């Protein structure tokens, strides 16, 4: 229950591909209340992305089976019930991350870069809630996602270079939000195209440290643009 110890255990867990363990270690580190180092922030993000990603993948599989068993009442009801069980896990994971963000990560962020990083992650995890939201709750969840993305977007444009991997990755995910959650393909394409074009225009702002991340995300942006205009 010492911080440097918790971080070392999270690195062990990562090596062991035990992402539940690794998320629990970094939840405990975050709850100690001090601002996370960049290393600690990336461990937290990697851990929860793997934890929530497993449920999102399972949810898509079962949701697809549910749709393919239309007209097969017993099978479809079993798929529905299993999907709902997975949804409960997914919501609980998202609610944990979103609570860490509200209580510690966003209030403690002393730099523009990490403000953008954590508002992006707030947008992402509300987007994951939106992926499985139905009914009365969905509108407010979508609104929370959009508001977090929008604030991150404004800070990133004011404070970071157009080639910054966090600014580019924010554009990528905000664009996906518009396409998939808001069913707004033209806005999605405009956002992704602008982010790609503004980075192309200032490639001298790349750094040796992060140019591989930047150019990867630029390719993903154009890959989405290609998919959505095909």
């Amino acid at each position: 229950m010492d911080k440097n110890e918790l971080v070392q255990k999270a690195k062990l867990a990562e090596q062991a591909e035990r992402y539940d363990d690794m998320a629990a270690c970094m939840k405990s580190v975050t709850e100690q209340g001090a601002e996370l180092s960049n290393e600690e922030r990336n461990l937290l993000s990697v851990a929860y992305k793997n934890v929530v990603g497993a449920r999102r993948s399972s949810w898509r599989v079962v949701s697809s089976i549910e749709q393919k068993t239309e007209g097969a009442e017993k099978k479809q009801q079993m798929a529905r019930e299993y999907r709902e069980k997975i949804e409960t896990e997914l919501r609980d994971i998202c609610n944990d991350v979103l609570s860490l963000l509200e209580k510690f990560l966003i209030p403690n962020a002393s730099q523009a870069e990490s403000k953008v990083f954590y508002l992006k992650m707030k947008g992402d995890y509300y987007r994951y809630l939106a992926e499985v939201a139905a009914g009365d709750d969905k509108k407010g969840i979508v609104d929370q996602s959009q508001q977090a993305y929008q604030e991150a977007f404004e800070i990133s444009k004011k404070e970071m270079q157009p080639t910054h991997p966090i600014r580019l990755g924010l554009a990528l995910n905000f664009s996906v939000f518009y396409y998939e959650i808001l069913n707004s393909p033209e806005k999605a394409c405009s956002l992704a195209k602008t982010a790609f074009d503004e980075a192309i225009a200032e490639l001298d702002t790349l750094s040796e440290e992060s140019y591989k991340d930047s150019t990867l995300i630029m390719q993903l942006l154009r890959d989405n643009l290609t998919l959505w205009t095909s």
Binding site: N42, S45, K49, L172, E180, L216, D223, N224, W228
Partner: peptide, 7 residues
């Protein structure tokens, strides 16, 4: 399928 950020 479309991509979001790996991280």
């Amino acid at each position: 399928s479309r991509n979001s950020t790996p991280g």
